Design an enzyme around this catalytic site. Structure first.
Site, PDB file in Angstrom:
ATOM      1  CB  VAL B  18      -1.035  -0.019   1.147  1.00 51.91           C
ATOM      2  CG1 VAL B  18      -1.880   1.259   1.151  1.00 51.91           C
ATOM      3  CG2 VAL B  18      -1.932  -1.252   1.041  1.00 51.91           C
ATOM      4  CG  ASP B 127      -8.611  -9.774   9.151  1.00 48.59           C
ATOM      5  OD1 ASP B 127      -8.207 -10.256  10.246  1.00 48.59           O
ATOM      6  OD2 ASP B 127      -7.836  -9.351   8.253  1.00 48.59           O
ATOM      7  CD  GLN B 131      -3.106  -4.607  13.362  1.00 49.43           C
ATOM      8  OE1 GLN B 131      -3.850  -4.703  14.397  1.00 49.43           O
ATOM      9  NE2 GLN B 131      -1.789  -4.785  13.350  1.00 49.43           N
ATOM     10  CG  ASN B 132      -7.755  -4.924   9.036  1.00 49.67           C
ATOM     11  OD1 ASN B 132      -6.806  -4.627   8.303  1.00 49.67           O
ATOM     12  ND2 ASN B 132      -8.032  -6.190   9.302  1.00 49.67           N
TER      13      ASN B 132
END
Ligand code: A1IOI
EC number: 2.7.11.22
Lengths: 267, 291
Positions: B18, B127, B131-132
């Site tokens: 990313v 999930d 961090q998401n």
């Protein structure tokens, strides 16, 4: 209407509206072959029947087959002047994208090239998959004809479900899908009309929300297909090696459905 | 891809790489997700086909927007809206002072709205973890990484945010797995540390039992029948929620315990959580039409 019960996880009005909107935005054309003058409707039926055959050989789900069928018809409506020699590549690539999306451990690329006997290579399938996905504008989440049968069976056995009745209706939907005229009717109407032919109008209104007037033209179109299936008797639930017995109804099957299609097309 | 200028590499994982980038003409700042195709024998990764197709249909203010999909010879770039930080970095940065309660409430409210939108589309994120969760400088938080996202699904999230039914071998996933992760994140925002920081599946289960108590057929009917349940599991008493989450009021502890309910069938839904008195201030009354 809306046949959904009160849902704990979400508002049933929102869940059902999104599903109806999915059918709005995903478009199908029963005259897409007019854009390809060298093509005749019997080619589409033979190709879809072949994909059904390779699906059973690899124990692929019915959703995987209907994802490929929908991707094929929708992609072909974005194209022009396609020759019949290119139809096997477009079909097996539609099936490759679908298996990747729906299966947990899908067949490998070399297995998709193999079933074509050298008419399609892995490189060609990889080039074609990107052409199909880009031409479909990455719109690969349709509500298939078989997903609607699944929704209807879930509502019926709430008011899990029985495998034998499911595969008999699915078997009738498989015969209908070989005729491009089925694309006149929304996927949810084809599944509601196939369910009606195996039950009653009262049950289809209860599980699908549709009124009789909604499915009536589809019912009268399906009448020959339904009768050809009734004359011969419905199929028995098969057991699939390496497939859980509570999932055998969801595995694509194959039959001598091309002669049945000719009998239904005559009347 | 000629109209983009890479500014910095934000990360690299199973998602690919990313980058932070600029539209040379437009001047906009986007996040680019790069996917190598030349190194892929099976073509476009199934996880990328699913993410792209899903995000084209999931448009919500609390879900990262997929702006475009560019194919550039042996590469596939997914152009996303840019966000300045992830929740884990923010939480570590704010660990000494603490995240102010009004902001915890705001982030949780937005998370539950994003989650409720996903669930109304019948999509499980599968999930959910810090961090998401991407935050911006204008007060917003958005759900990211829809690689494991499946529309309902059978069982085959990183350990810390994994629901107990998953650890106990349940065969099918439900919307209640995402709610469990949000409750963990909600408690993590409050306590400034992970609620259940296990180092194995059995350790994760025992750590969950030390805070909520070992489950029985009364609190969770079906639990003893489950595949990975053992009768030898130590008997732990449910800790008092005033010690588990001290900065939380009565309304906060109520919502948290409903999100962390053992039974997937009784765990609060995202839509029901948004109507909890913990968000009486943030939510507005709407007239119901009986009909
Ligand atoms: C593609 C959607 N999108 C938009 N803005 C970001 C974004 N922003 C971000 C995170 C931080 S950090 C690490 O220092 O907290 N800095 N920045 C500038 N990070 C990400 N991440 C972080 C990652 F490590 F690169 C993985 C990726 C994820 C899979 C979670 O979406 N995705 C974004």
């Amino acid at each position: 209407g809306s046949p959904l019960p009160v849902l704990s996880w979400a508002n049933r009005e929102e869940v059902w509206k999104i599903m109806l909107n999915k059918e709005k935005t995903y478009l199908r054309d029963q005259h897409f072959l007019e854009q390809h003058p060298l093509l005749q409707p019997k080619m589409r039926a033979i190709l879809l029947d072949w994909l059904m055959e390779v699906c059973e050989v690899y124990k692929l789900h019915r959703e995987t087959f209907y994802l490929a069928q929908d991707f094929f018809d929708r992609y072909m409506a974005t194209q022009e002047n396609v020759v019949k020699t290119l139809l096997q590549l477009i079909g097996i690539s539609s099936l490759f994208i679908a298996a990747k999306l729906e299966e947990i451990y899908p067949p490998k690329l070399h297995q998709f090239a193999y079933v074509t006997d050298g008419a399609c290579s892995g490189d060609e399938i990889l080039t074609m998959e990107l052409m199909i996905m880009k031409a479909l504008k990455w719109r690969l989440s349709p509500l298939t004809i078989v997903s609607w049968l699944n929704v209807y069976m879930q509502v019926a056995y709430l008011n899990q479900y029985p495998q034998q009745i499911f595969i008999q209706i699915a078997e009738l939907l498989d015969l209908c899908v070989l005729d491009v005229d089925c694309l006149e009717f929304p996927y949810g109407i084809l599944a509601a009309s196939a369910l009606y032919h195996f039950s009653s109008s009262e049950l289809m209104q209860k599980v699908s929300g549709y009124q009789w007037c909604d499915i009536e033209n589809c019912v009268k179109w399906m009448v020959p297909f339904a009768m050809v299936i009734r004359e011969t008797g419905s199929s028995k639930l098969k057991h699939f090696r390496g497939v859980a017995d509570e999932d055998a109804h969801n595995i694509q099957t194959h039959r001598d459905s091309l002669d049945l299609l000719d009998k239904a097309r005559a009347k | 891809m000629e109209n983009f200028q890479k500014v910095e590499k934000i990360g690299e994982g199973t998602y690919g790489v990313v980058y932070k980038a600029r539209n040379k003409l437009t001047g906009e700042v986007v996040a680019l997700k790069k996917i190598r195709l030349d190194t892929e024998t099976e073509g476009v990764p199934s996880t990328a086909i699913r993410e792209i197709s899903l995000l084209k249909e999931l448009n919500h203010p609390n879900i990262v927007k997929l702006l475009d999909v560019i194919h550039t010879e042996n590469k596939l770039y997914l152009v996303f809206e840019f966000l300045h930080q992830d929740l884990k970095k923010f939480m570590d940065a704010s660990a000494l002072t603490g995240i102010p309660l009004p902001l915890i409430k705001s982030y949780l409210f937005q998370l539950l709205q994003g989650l409720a939108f996903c669930h109304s589309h019948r999509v499980l994120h599968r999930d959910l973890k810090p961090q998401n969760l991407l935050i911006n400088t204008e007060g917003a938080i958005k759900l990211a990484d829809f690689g494991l996202a499946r529309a309902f699904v059978r069982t085959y999230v990183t350990l810390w945010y994994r629901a107990p039914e998953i650890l106990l071998g349940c065969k099918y996933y439900s919307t209640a797995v995402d709610i469990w992760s949000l409750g963990c994140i909600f408690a993590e925002m409050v306590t400034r540390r992970a609620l259940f920081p296990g180092d194995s599946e059995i350790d994760q289960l025992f750590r969950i039992f030390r805070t909520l108590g070992t489950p029985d057929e009364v609190v969770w009917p079906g639990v003893t029948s489950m595949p990975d349940y053992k009768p030898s599991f130590p008997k732990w008493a449910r800790q008092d929620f005033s010690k588990v989450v001290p900065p939380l009021d009565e309304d906060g502890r109520s919502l948290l315990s409903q999100m962390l309910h053992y039974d997937p069938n009784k765990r609060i839904s995202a839509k029901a959580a948004l109507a909890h008195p913990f968000f009486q201030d943030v939510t507005k009354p709407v007239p119901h039409l009986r009909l």
